[PDB]
């Protein structure tokens, strides 16, 4: 007689006993063990004491339970299994970084997964707390599949890596990330103190200096300035549509895209001797392989700048 | 008022200016339907920023202080495999 832990959310268990050899899907359904569809194999010694996660099937409060620990409905928390399932890429590993060998259109998920492995990072929930713990000891098969399952991404489609890093960040605790930015037009003026995935997250330009010195976006008068007269984040991404080559200053890693419409994402870091990735591949530095679309920065991020009034 | 009409623009990467009819209770989703009418892009298309900040589909144009004639810019998200 083998003990186990039966639960849906990671939260709320059940104990049962199950005889040795028993198929674990006759008795009880679709369940996954530590990542791995369980179903068909028999019950050993080796589960004893372990937790096996059903999903089919929920009634509202097992709803409304797995929306609290994983952050999913019933659709998600299927896409989140079957994911797990069908992304079995093989994981390469390059010193202190992983990167994933080329299979159905993953490279957004590659270039967001190095790039995610330059920061650190605090979860609201326990099962993406452990899932990225398992990600930052080179097993990150849970958290992409928790990723593609929690955005919608569709599998074995060509999709957007700063996504992919959007909403890993959505998840964390980045409640003492603060910018403070000023927007100065001449239809009116704007003051902003933004938080969370809202001041580690830019989209508009590249680069830090460009939020630092102010820069001009498109309005409907005759320019608006969008300028940070306070900084203090952990890291920073400063994200847009792909349309220079030109690397700013202090960039650590960087993510680039190639096509004309559908394309693909290599990545680059900018270390003692400067690496380019494409998949599990490495190789020296020669320049950018498209245009860049994610600039991660890490040092010297707290900073007061003056007001332009 | 949350249910007056007001404009509002949305800058296109190929030039162009959209001119919206939104009220302050509007969700994002929203504002994204009305773009698909006008343009054609599916909402999970689209990508809504103001000045630097990406806006989620359940919060409202009130929410963010959009306010009339306020700018927004459009992006699609892209496709690498
Ligand atoms: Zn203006």
Known sequence: ?309 | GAMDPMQIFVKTLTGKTITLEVEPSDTIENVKAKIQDKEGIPPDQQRLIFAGKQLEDGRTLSDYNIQKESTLHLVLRLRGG
Request: glycine share 8%; charged share 20%.
């Open chain 1, 1 to 309: 007689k083998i003990d186990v832990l039966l639960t849906v959310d990671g939260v709320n268990f059940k104990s049962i006993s199950l005889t040795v050899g028993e198929v674990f899907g006759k008795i009880l359904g679709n369940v996954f063990c530590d990542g791995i569809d369980v179903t068909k194999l028999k019950c050993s010694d080796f589960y004893a004491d372990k937790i096996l996660y059903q999903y089919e099937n929920l009634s509202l409060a097992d709803i409304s339970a797995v929306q609290s620990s994983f952050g999913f409905d019933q659709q998600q928390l299927l896409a989140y299994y079957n994911f797990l399932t069908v992304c079995k890429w093989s994981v390469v590993v390059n010193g202190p970084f992983f990167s994933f060998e080329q299979s159905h259109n993953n490279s957004y998920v590659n270039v967001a997964c190095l790039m995610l492995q330059h920061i650190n990072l605090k979860f609201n929930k326990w099962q993406w707390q452990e899932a990225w713990y398992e990600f930052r000891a080179g097993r990150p098969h849970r958290l992409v599949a928790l990723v593609l399952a929690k955005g919608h991404f569709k599998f074995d489609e060509p999709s957007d890596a700063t996504d992919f890093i959007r909403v890993v960040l959505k998840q964390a605790d980045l409640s003492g990330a603060i910018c403070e930015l000023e927007l100065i037009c001449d239809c009116g003026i704007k003051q902003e103190s933004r938080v969370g995935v809202d001041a580690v997250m830019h989209f508009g330009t590249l680069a830090k200096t460009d939020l630092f010195n102010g820069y001009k976006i498109g309005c409907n008068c005759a320019g608006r300035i969008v300028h940070c007269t306070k900084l203090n984040v952990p890291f920073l991404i400063c994200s847009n549509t792909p349309l220079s080559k030109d690397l700013p200053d202090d960039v650590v890693a960087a993510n680039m895209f190639m096509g004309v419409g559908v394309g693909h994402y290599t990545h680059l870091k900018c270390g003692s001797p400067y690496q380019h990735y494409d998949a599990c591949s490495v190789k020296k530095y020669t320049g950018v392989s498209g245009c860049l679309t994610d600039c991660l920065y890490l040092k010297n991020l707290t900073q007061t700048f003056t007001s332009m009034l």
